[PDB]
């Protein structure tokens, strides 16, 4: 076992897929000689060169469309947005040119492409650099949307994303880049894959099901550890995939715990938690709920700059515990 950060785990994933398939290449801003805007692609340009690691100008709509074009022509690009806030300039290419193309062609033109980059809140980057796009991209047919949390999640999903013959959006997290995790030998392998569409239970529990994705999954584990000292066993579930989400794992947990709380970083209205709550109500686990499911989300505001204000615009550990204790009437 090794100590591997999520940033190093993504670097391992992309490196192994570049070495495996010469049709795979990476393009984006500062991905080459700068070693990555967040050092995620460090050393890749020194290993593969201008042909496979392509520094692009600040022209989001332009190089995203260029990536999709190369994907239609038979290549397997990795298109990095510096943050996904900047993907809104290219979101027409993601949705209309990439996601919908295979369906419109009647099964003739596939688009094997990956859109990766950090997503959601950071630290002091204010309103225009803190938006979470999990619900937006998960809303669209023809896409696959994933949101890794730890190092295992990051490497396994980035490798599945590249090998999938369809557009995959990889919503990363900047604050998770530098966090180390125990990396078991199974994750160090070049054949390590995490299938898209299956969630992982990070903690077994019996009193309440807590579902989350990306960085707040760690806060759920912190909350569950505090509540465990009080006799409350939380079952924390890591979505991993946003579309198509693994509701069967959530439903099976709710049928055991009889309680559900969703935790997400993005905005509340029409967000990820809203879909999970609608699905349990339409689904077979609704009769097993002994209390309504509640959503823990970010504040319904543009992200403020000040440290004290941003801290209260993001789900905190005490916010998860408070919602959990409300659900259990304790």
């Amino acid at each position: 076992s090794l100590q591997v950060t999520v940033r190093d785990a993504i670097n391992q994933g992309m490196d192994e897929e570049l070495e495996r398939d010469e049709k795979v290449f990476l393009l984006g801003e500062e991905v080459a000689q700068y070693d990555g805007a967040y050092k995620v692609s460090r050393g890749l340009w020194k290993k593969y060169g201008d042909k496979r690691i392509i520094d692009t100008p600040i022209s989001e709509m332009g190089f995203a469309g260029i990536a999709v074009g190369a994907a239609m022509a038979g290549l397997r690009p990795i298109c990095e947005f510096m943050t996904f806030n900047f993907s809104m300039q290219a979101i027409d290419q993601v949705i209309n040119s990439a996601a919908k193309t295979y369906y419109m062609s009647g099964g003739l033109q596939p688009v094997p492409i990956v859109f990766r980059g950090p997503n959601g809140a950071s630290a002091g980057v204010a309103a225009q650099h803190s938006q979470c796009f999990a619900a937006w991209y998960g809303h669209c047919p023809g896409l696959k949307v994933v949101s890794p949390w730890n190092s295992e999640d990051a490497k396994g999903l980035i490798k599945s994303a590249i090998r999938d013959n369809n557009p995959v959006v990889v919503l990363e997290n900047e604050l998770m880049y530098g966090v180390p995790f125990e990396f078991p030998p199974e994750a160090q392998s070049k054949d390590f894959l995490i299938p898209i569409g299956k969630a992982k239970i990070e903690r077994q529990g019996t009193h309440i099901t807590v579902v989350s994705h990306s960085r707040p999954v760690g806060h759920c584990l912190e909350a569950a550890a505090v509540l465990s000292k009080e006799g409350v066993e939380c079952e924390v579930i890591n979505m991993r995939t946003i579309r198509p989400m693994d509701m069967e794992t959530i439903e099976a947990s709710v049928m055991k715990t009889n309680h559900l709380v969703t935790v997400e970083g993005g905005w509340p209205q029409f967000g990820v938690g809203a879909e999970i709550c609608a699905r349990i109500m339409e689904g077979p686990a609704f009769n097993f709920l002994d209390a309504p499911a509640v959503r823990v989300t970010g504040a319904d505001v543009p992200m403020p700059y000040a440290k004290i204000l941003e801290d209260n615009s993001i789900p905190q550990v005490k916010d998860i515990i408070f919602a959990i204790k409300k659900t259990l009437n304790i």
Binding site: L75, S105, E282
Partner: protein
């Protein structure tokens, strides 16, 4: 009663931008190529006229942009490239779908939204795809970066293939086109940017809009003039000199709007007709025999497109993802489940 095998023709001189020498002003057209180009243009013409008829009869729904009057472009460009080269355009792709190899039956059945269509009735007028034909695209300007990426794959694979990336003059102010100019020149992509000008914008010299990319303005009603410019632009990209911009000046047929003064003087089928008869490449009776065969083939295809049934409802969710296992998609409510197969 004697037919010349070939004939030399004077072609219009292209206006240049950042180029010292342009395409030749003379070209050789053989009898076989003339008859081939003529049959191809007359097929595209009768196909668009039939589509216009079905559109008025409301058999075709939604959009139906016709390319009649521009037959020298889609046929002229095909004569100047290889089947192993790549091409992409916007929403007016009926002619290019036929010139890139699809049959008139497939194109009309797709227009009428039937199971026999090239896209199985899923795409309609704007989304028809073929081998090395990356289709029409409904979002204006979006196909220009897509084509630049296809040119990137051409350079990536190193088989000396080029990509033709077309856009109309109305799309010439899309910002993503200027982003594609800069990247294509920066990486020397074998991309031929083609602006289809129909005769809003502070500069109407579309062949100069690439600034650093050289351009040439071509008469798009002369098929031989388009063929020679395409051969020039394709050779330019194959030499590794990077991208090139090409403006095709054409006119669309779809009182003051008399404008028979474009059909009478500048119709691309009539120009190739007059050139071949005066140079003894073919007879007037020969070209009328071709018109009859083409008209019969379109009515036979239109009959197929009219009688062909709609796609089955069971295939509504088919082909969402490629190379994926089967799954179910949600319908109008949670009790409607459509099976999705790659």
């Amino acid at each position: 009663g004697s037919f010349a095998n070939d004939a030399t023709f004077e072609i219009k001189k292209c206006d240049l931008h950042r180029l010292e020498e342009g395409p030749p002003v003379t070209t050789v057209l053989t009898r076989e190529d003339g008859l081939k180009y003529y049959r191809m243009m007359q097929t595209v013409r009768r196909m668009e006229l039939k589509a216009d008829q079905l559109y008025k009869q409301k058999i075709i729904r939604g959009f139906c942009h016709l390319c009649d009057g521009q037959e020298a472009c889609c046929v002229g460009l095909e004569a100047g490239i290889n089947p192993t080269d790549h091409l992409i355009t916007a929403y007016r792709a009926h002619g290019f779908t036929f010139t890139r190899g699809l049959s008139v039956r497939e194109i009309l059945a797709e227009l009428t939204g039937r199971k026999g269509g090239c896209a199985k009735g899923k795409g309609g007028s704007m989304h028809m795809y073929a081998k090395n034909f990356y289709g029409g695209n409904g979002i204006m300007g979006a196909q220009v970066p897509l084509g630049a990426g296809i040119a990137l794959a051409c350079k990536y694979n190193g088989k000396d293939e080029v990509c033709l990336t077309l856009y109309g003059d109305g799309a010439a102010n899309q910002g993503q086109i200027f982003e594609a100019y800069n990247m294509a020149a920066l990486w020397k992509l074998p991309c031929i940017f083609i602006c289809e000008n129909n005769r809003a914008a502070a500069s109407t010299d579309y062949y100069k809009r690439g600034d650093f990319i050289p351009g040439l303005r071509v008469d798009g009603m002369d098929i031989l003039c388009v063929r020679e410019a395409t051969r020039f632009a394709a050779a330019y990209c194959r030499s590794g000199k990077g991208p090139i911009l090409m403006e095709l000046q054409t006119y669309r047929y779809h009182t003051r709007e008399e404008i028979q003064e474009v059909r009478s003087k500048s119709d691309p089928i009539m120009l190739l007709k007059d050139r071949m008869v005066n140079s003894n490449l073919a007879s007037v009776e020969e070209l009328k025999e071709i018109d009859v065969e083409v008209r019969k083939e379109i009515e036979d295809a239109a009959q197929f497109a009219t009688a062909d049934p709609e796609p089955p409802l069971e295939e509504l969710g088919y082909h969402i993802y490629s190379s994926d296992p089967p799954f179910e998609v949600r319908g109008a409510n949670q009790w409607i489940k459509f099976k999705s197969v790659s």
